[PDB]
Write a protein that binds this ligand. Structure first.
Ligand SMILES: Nc1nc2c(ncn2[C@@H]2O[C@H](COP(=O)(O)O)[C@@H](O)[C@H]2O)c(=O)[nH]1
Ligand SMILES: Nc1nc2c(ncn2[C@@H]2O[C@H](COP(=O)(O)O)[C@@H](O)[C@H]2O)c(=O)[nH]1
Lengths: 830, 828, 279
């Protein structure tokens, strides 16, 4: 929501688009609330309270100080992710195209002949992970960098098997200008990099479910984490494959053999991590260029040993420029070995070269076998070619994207693999694997069993909510797990559809009430981002791939007003109320008509009994960052910290939301409202004195209207009690005697309350009524009725016309407790 | 958008919701444009020029003076329609429900026992037509009134055969709070009343197509207007009806017999108007309550002479308080007669009572016959009951909604009807008509045949666009009419579907290019509202039931910048470019990549080709008030921007690419259609095979150059030798201007593989002015591709270098034979 | 799937529409299988194995012997439900409209002035529950009756609050000719009436979940069954209701006070059944 606070003295004015202006010196939390309810994208903050900036940032709303209006202000007309703890700004902005450049996260790409295939004059410039090397471009009051890169395009080109790069880059850039900004993808890079270190330091055992190739670099420094992904391609599974012949498909114009090498070595690193939770020694044979080491070293320090006749720049120690044949004993006991040996494309016939390469393949495989036969705790990966050969059945198969699909694959072998059953594999099956399979993911770990773990911190970022996963197992995991961070699809669909999908790929959808979590925060990406110290320029759109984030066993659950608060609950409510609606009063109007309070709708903008629940039910697709359930619960057990609202006040908003949904045919909001009302009636064991025996009544000295009944009284309470509780009731009355006479009782008009009932309004007594309802309910005394409480002084049982007077205070003369249908009053304090 | 202008004295500011602020005195017409491109609903204007406030109001955008911050400002946080000519404000706001009241614009309703069936304690409060009686409530710098009424509910209740009013009103009120404000419905009530008087005065002959019961009162004062509706129910058509018996269905809890009487009389008035184009005398018999006269008299004066026993209507000149039996000679020759004979009942038998009513009906029918036997100009309406009887074949049958369906109907009779064939009609058929039909419309006039009329001002207000009307007949009417105001549904669908519909009721959809109008304004409801002196606080939502408005042959067509202007062209463009976009430069970047200007993206924030058209094509669902067609045409034949035609074509190609990427089929069509219109209006030629060229030479070149002769190729042309002199003339015509331009260069870049050039700035505007001069003089200038001003430096495929802004020498300008050593001119 | 087996000697031939022909003497279960895989609606069975008819009937496929080709065969060009244990044929067929008549399951309706509000000349004729009194119309090799009635229309008119019966009946009849036959609704009446007696006799304790008003008559003789439906309207729940005044809405042209009385008494019977499992 991009709130920018600039100095009041330097309150510069320009007509920027979608801007707003706010400033006030009354409270520090309500300035944040009122800012959170502004309707535009950018907000300009002029009294610039540091406290209020911190509150916004905790809520996920980006709030930063602006000191160099000349450049700081103008260079923030784009979205960004703000690390407010370290005061860092990560710009997600593709204006750098005006420099005729493509930006990448990876250094190795700069060494390929990629620039030739770009548009004429274009270059690609390395920017570092999340634009770390761009900090020179921006020298502001804060550290500033541009996290936007074109790496998605390059990776898509590599996996797309289409050849011509010029048109591909051009098409993808034009598309990027035609579609809205990929905020989720770009800010999640920052969130991953900040999140997982905090978890590894802060928690004993961290389990990450379904990592994707995007974060392959994130976990390079954290072997403590146990990863669960899709299964690996085993050799035994090649029995199903139909035999095929050589097929020379070219996928990339520029040589990407280094990307293949890097994905291979990283896959091996993570296999080793999965087996032994420690960082291994890396041994590499071949891999002469080896530039990508740099990109790995940016995330974790590793010890690299290289054997290649050419030079390898970034290696730790290039043990020998000479080739490696029988030097097995140099290899230490806790390590991984990458064997990429290609002798040479000789200038001989292709058949002769094939025999040469086949013999070389057998040599490499035997080298791997000797590597793993001698020593415990090691893993290896070999380059083989497609031929008839006998591989172990449990070995893992790798074919990552390479420049051309030309009869090569890789075999990943642990020590359990070497002495295992070996099977004969024809060249046709291996060719079928090379041609029909491209390895999608470097995480080859066994799938995650969706069971609650008591010693683990489970992290399911975008993996659990899928069409094929068991829904009830997901619900039980979220419900009963301690210490977790799990994400599901939101079900922002009308008609309450239980799945949502794109081109026959579907996801399960959940409402916040579909869970029964005891102690957890159920918020948006904004809320979860704030809980971990980040804020963002751009909120979730109501219709999109929006996810609920659920944090189980968090430090922050009891900080109700601090994290996943009601910031922005009324942003959409206010936009609709002031632009499109029939009247700005429509809300109070509808809420009173929904609770059968139509008897008078006269100036109901004052002292309405409905609550936050109405906007959390109706506009949930916008403000689901609120966590309505925790808000209700924490106010059940004070341990009402700011509000002290009676439960009937919550139930009334529930009923109003149900009627609204039925009018709009919003089936989802109808369910959500019914379920929240159920949760309320579970947390509060509410009772209704629909058949009362006694009542509390207030009597006034003067009555500014013509009255036709003998006794004008305000029925201020109605209750159902046994006689023995009359002292208890009395005590509770005494408990607020001061407060009872303190209230500023006012009346301004008379109206018809029902057929044959003519009453005078009473104002200013309702807050006291709710405090007293809370006290009676806490004391297990049945107080209140099924209907809504309407404070009124009955004037006559006749049908008379409405009369108005100026606000005339009313004065209390006695506050009595009387038995219904008994002329006997059982208490009369003055 | 509510534009609210506050004075320096009232420069007070609060945090109003969805608010914005603008103010400036360094620009003239651009203050209105820049206001028109702001994103929120309400805007506050602080250092305001009266001129730009007027420009906004002419464009349809409501712009009001605000002086009473205490009440006037707080009470304009709701939408309204503003008559800026008379400076009056019609509020459309239903906050008045907080008074426990139902508001009607009709006085007769107040006399019924309707208040009894409302919610307890609620009242019904008569308000003036379009809230005339609310002006007392508001004491502002301007006239102010609240046009919102609950008549939607009352009318729907009467026509919906729902029984219980209390629940119906309650449900409809809740619905009204749950759905957005019916602005089209409410403000068109104002628009009709301002429109049609202006048309009657300003034009001789006015034809109104398909009026509905909503505007029943509007045309009461204009028999000059000839209206065409769906048609009448004739007695001749009762042969189809299957015989039925009495079925006593109750329609309303409170007596609405006065609505029936009024609708009958009004139907008769409009029939009389249809036959003889002049206002009649009104004679009525029975009609004891007589209030609806008031509601009629508020729009037009009529002469009301009623005969009613011992009862006194409202304003009827009571020719006799005695019962009327054989006084036919008292009734004048230019008149209308309504025969509602009370027919009072009693406590007698229902069968005997039926015979009583039958005899009374026969008396009434003979009464009508005696009325019509004489006279040159008369029309009559009679109350009958269901019985066997012989009615004229050409007579019209009326059954307007009444309290109960109790064996009663009304017959409309012409002077032509009496002298026509009479046919026997059984009681069963009459019961079938009473039970199965309620007359929907008081205009029973024959339908409009969709043919152009040359002497008439035709008005088709939401009537022509429909599934069943001939689409090509509509296109020809709009295209070839001389003086009309016609509305059609706009094709705001993403897939190019030519129809749009709900529950088997469909409408044809058109694009602005689907027409070929000669001199006409094709704009939105806002634009049309502005042309007639009204403005509105909030524009139409892009995917609503939005209508194109076409005004043929108006005085305002040539006033381009005043009406149907470019206000709001970039409102959505600016919201998208900031906010959600990948980059704030995204627009210029995409137009340069789509027109093959990808060689460099450096010099594109400055000196880009057209984008005025770009946002009018792709964001058309928002700014369809622009009328891009007249804008293109008027700039072909001057009658400011001085924009080259290729400049428009490039934006067309960019919009086509954008639509193809978004799969916006309608925008793709619209873009291709506009490019077609451009190449139609401009007979463009391209010198793709160059013959000669214009070259500029400078002494200073801040970069290392590896070519022998550095020059800026400022032109390419295909010409005959005989035309070489004329070209020189044009060069001389702006020689000063050519050396005058402040040409600047800032960096070097790659223009293609193996080409290394330096950017050029400040020459492009001169290039377009000169292109216009070449095209006007029928000399082929320019190329199919886009013009890129550059000085070739080398064919060396070298890396790009940047320097500070360096001016250029312009030592010489010249025209040289391409591939020839011959230069044919070289001015100092 | 309407398999009709007729005598091989009397193998009459006509070009009926959607018919088929099968006959074989190799196996008794595979003749049933091969018949079950034929594609048309009606099948004509010529070697007419009694065993194979029983197998089909056990599978749900109607399989009946045809002996009076002249009328039995032609009066089976309509769908039906076949009680193959008792050899009874319940026709679900609305051809009886050609007799200018409306058929009802309930005797009380005949005492109301309903016939006046029909189309001219039309009558309503009581036919008994699932057409028990229609067995006189059909005297075939099997017991035969027409279970089709217009009672759905009358009940819908009573609950629809629209007044004019003539147009309502006409509209609903025209609709019935324009839409396919409501087989599920009509055969489920027969299935309920056969099913629940078998269950009460065959099982100790029978629980029926969510009975609807349609089968209000089915359980009149079985108080052993415990029924579970939607909750009742309690007096205490009137506290929520908004106060209103007299509103005289007329829902039916002919007096249906007897339907009200019957529904009241039957509701009371079932409440008593729910409390005390006896009549
Ligand atoms: N009863 C009640 N009303 C609230 C509460 N919070 C906000 N509101 C009402 O909601 C309004 C803003 O939300 P809106 O009605 O515009 O959606 C405020 O002006 C206030 O009257 C609450 O906790 N309880
Ligand atoms: N209206 C208009 N805008 C132009 C024209 N040429 C360039 N522009 C640019 O287009 C912007 C309008 O918003 P856009 O959708 O291009 O972002 C203006 O701010 C301006 O910088 C033109 O001829 N007409």
């Amino acid at each position: 929501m991009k709130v920018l606070a600039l100095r009041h003295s330097v309150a510069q004015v320009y007509a920027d688009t979608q801007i707003y202006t706010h400033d006030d010196t009354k409270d520090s939390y309500e300035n944040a609330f009122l800012i959170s309810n502004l309707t535009t994208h950018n907000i300009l903050y002029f009294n610039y309270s540091a406290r209020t900036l911190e509150i916004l940032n905790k809520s996920g709303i980006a709030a930063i100080e602006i000191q160099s209006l000349e450049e700081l202000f103008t260079l923030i007309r784009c979205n960004f992710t703000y690390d407010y703890e370290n005061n860092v700004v990560y710009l997600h902005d593709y204006s750098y195209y005006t420099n005729n450049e493509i930006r990448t996260d990876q250094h190795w790409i700069t060494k390929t002949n990629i620039e030739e295939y770009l548009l004429p004059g274009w270059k690609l410039t390395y920017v570092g992970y999340n634009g770390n090397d761009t900090r020179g471009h921006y020298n502001f009051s804060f550290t500033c960098q541009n996290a936007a890169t074109d790496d998605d395009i390059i990776i898509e080109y590599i996996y797309s098997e289409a050849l011509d790069f010029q048109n591909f880059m051009l098409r993808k850039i034009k598309e990027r200008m035609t579609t809205s900004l990929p905020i989720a993808r770009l800010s999640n890079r920052v969130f991953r990099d900040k999140l997982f270190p905090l978890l590894v330091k802060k928690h004993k055992r961290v389990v990450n479910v379904g990592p994707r190739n995007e974060s392959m670099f994130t976990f390079l420094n954290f072997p403590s984490i146990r990863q669960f992904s899709n299964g690996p391609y085993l050799v035994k599974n090649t029995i199903k494959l139909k035999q095929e012949r050589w097929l020379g498909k070219r996928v990339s114009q520029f040589d990407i053999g280094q990307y293949k090498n890097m994905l291979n070595v990283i896959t091996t690193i993570y296999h080793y991590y999965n087996l032994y939770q420690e960082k291994p020694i890396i041994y590499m044979v071949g891999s002469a260029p080896s530039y990508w080491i740099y990109d790995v070293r940016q995330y974790s320090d590793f010890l690299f040993e290289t054997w290649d006749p050419l030079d390898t720049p970034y290696s730790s120690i290039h043990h020998k420029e000479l080739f490696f044949a029988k030097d097995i004993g140099k290899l230490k006991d806790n390590s991984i070995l990458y064997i990429d040996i290609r002798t040479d494309r000789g200038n001989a016939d292709w058949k002769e070269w094939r025999k040469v390469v086949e013999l070389q393949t057998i040599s490499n495989l035997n080298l791997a076998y000797q590597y793993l036969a001698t020593g415990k705790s090691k893993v290896c990966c070999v380059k083989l070619t497609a031929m008839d050969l006998e591989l172990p059945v449990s070995a893992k198969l790798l074919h990552h994207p390479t420049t051309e699909i030309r009869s090569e694959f890789y075999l990943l072998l642990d020590i359990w693999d070497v002495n295992n059953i070996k099977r004969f594999i024809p060249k046709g099956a291996l060719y079928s694997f090379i041609n029909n399979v491209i390895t999608d993911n470097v995480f080859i770990q066994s799938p995650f069993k969706i069971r609650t773990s008591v010693s683990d911190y489970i992290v399911a970022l975008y993996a659990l909510s899928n069409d094929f996963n068991n829904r009830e197992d997901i619900i039980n995991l979220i419900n009963n797990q301690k210490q977790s961070l799990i994400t599901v699809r939101i079900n922002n669909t009308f008609k309450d559809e239980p799945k949502v999908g794109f081109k026959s790929i579907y996801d399960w959808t959940f409402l916040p009430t579909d869970f029964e979590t005891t102690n957890a925060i159920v918020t948006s990406y904004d809320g979860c981002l704030g809980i971990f110290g980040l804020s963002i320029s751009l909120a979730s759109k109501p219709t999109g791939n929006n996810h609920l984030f659920i944090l189980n066993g968090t430090d922050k659950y009891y900080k109700l007003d601090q994290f996943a608060n009601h910031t922005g609950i009324s942003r959409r409510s206010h936009q609709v109320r002031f632009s499109e609606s029939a009247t700005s009063y429509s809300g109070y109007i509808f809420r009173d008509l929904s609770n059968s309070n139509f008897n008078l709708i006269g100036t109901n903008v004052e002292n309405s009994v409905s609550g936050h629940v109405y906007n959390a039910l109706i506009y949930y697709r916008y403000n689901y960052s609120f966590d309505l359930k925790r808000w209700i619960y924490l106010h059940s057990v004070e341990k009402g910290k700011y509000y002290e609202h009676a439960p009937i006040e919550l139930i009334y908003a529930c009923k109003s939301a149900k009627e609204f949904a039925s009018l709009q045919d919003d089936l989802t909001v109808l369910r959500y409202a019914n379920e929240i009302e159920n949760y309320i009636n579970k947390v509060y064991s509410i009772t209704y004195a629909d058949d009362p025996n006694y009542f509390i009544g207030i009597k006034f000295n003067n009555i500014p209207y013509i009255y036709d009944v003998k006794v004008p009284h305000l029925t201020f309470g109605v209750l159902y009690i046994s006689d023995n509780m009359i002292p208890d009731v009395v005590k509770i009355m005494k408990s607020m005697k001061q407060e009872l006479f303190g209230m500023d009782v006012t009346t301004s008009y008379t109206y018809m309350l029902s057929d044959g009932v003519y009453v005078a309004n009473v104002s200013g007594v309702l807050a006291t009524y709710f405090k007293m309802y809370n006290l009676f309910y806490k004391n297990q005394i049945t107080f209140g009725q099924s209907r809504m409480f309407i404070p009124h002084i009955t004037l006559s049982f006749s049908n008379n016309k409405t009369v108005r007077i100026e606000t005339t205070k009313l004065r209390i003369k006695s506050i009595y407790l009387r038995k219904i249908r008994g002329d006997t009053v059982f208490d009369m304090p003055e």
